[PDB]
Design a protein around this ligand. Sequence first.
Ligand SMILES: [Co+2]
Ligand SMILES: [Co+2]
Ligand SMILES: [Co+2]
Length: 299
Amino acid sequence: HMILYGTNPIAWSNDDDRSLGAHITLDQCLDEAAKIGFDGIEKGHKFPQEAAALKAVLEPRGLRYVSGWHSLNLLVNSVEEEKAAMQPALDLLKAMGSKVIIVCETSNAIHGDNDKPLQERPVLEDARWEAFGLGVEALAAHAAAQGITLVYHHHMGTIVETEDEIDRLMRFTGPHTRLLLDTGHCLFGRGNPERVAQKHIARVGHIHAKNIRRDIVQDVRDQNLSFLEGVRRGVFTVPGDTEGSVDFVPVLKIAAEHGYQGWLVIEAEQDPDVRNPFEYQSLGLKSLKAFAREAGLDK
Ligand SMILES: [Co+2]
Ligand SMILES: [Co+2]
Ligand SMILES: [Co+2]
């Protein structure tokens, strides 16, 4: 299949606040992801990191290793220091047959800081954008020569959150650097997911189909809450949730018309005690397959 459907384990156990879903084992997360019908799953903090041990848990379940998140520190480290820091993840992705590496500059990110409101998130100095993009494209070209496509995950609480900052990254990068379009983080950052698709679909190498609850997002803006406070309150949900705001079909229709191939990943951090991972991820996969069908992306 050219279009593959994945999930992300943070719907079961959160990476940034490990108390969320701490009670859910790796076995429960992988068992349920396989039963629901996902073709594969992305890396989470409970995952093994040796290729032989990671195959031992994913192959019996029929799950492919979609990719793994890898933090960048180009704002405080050199490019060479970051090529070294990135190589271990490239070795695992290659050994696992993965074609993509997910990256995001977190040196000064605040999404993992429970005490810091999202409005206090870092903004990259205007002068630094060109050098930062050159460091990103250098890492992208390093990975591409090893057969791995680099996709940058724009994220709340980081220097790349707004739609205009997604444009600036895409202007100061290329050709190997690709965008990971996360529809949840895009709309949360006041961007328009459909408009971002129109501009950058040709450079999109990975897609996260994440929904948002508009009422909860407005609470995070009015009360000036942190990123993780929002997650615990339900800022994110899955495609198909009536409480969501993201219009997925127009995004997938743009991807269909430009011949996108690769993964569509249901990613929805929530409090798993209140938002049962099996129920919401099940609704996400069903709804996202139907949306992709309606958009002409999956036939
Ligand atoms: Co080149
Ligand atoms: Co995140
Ligand atoms: Co994402």
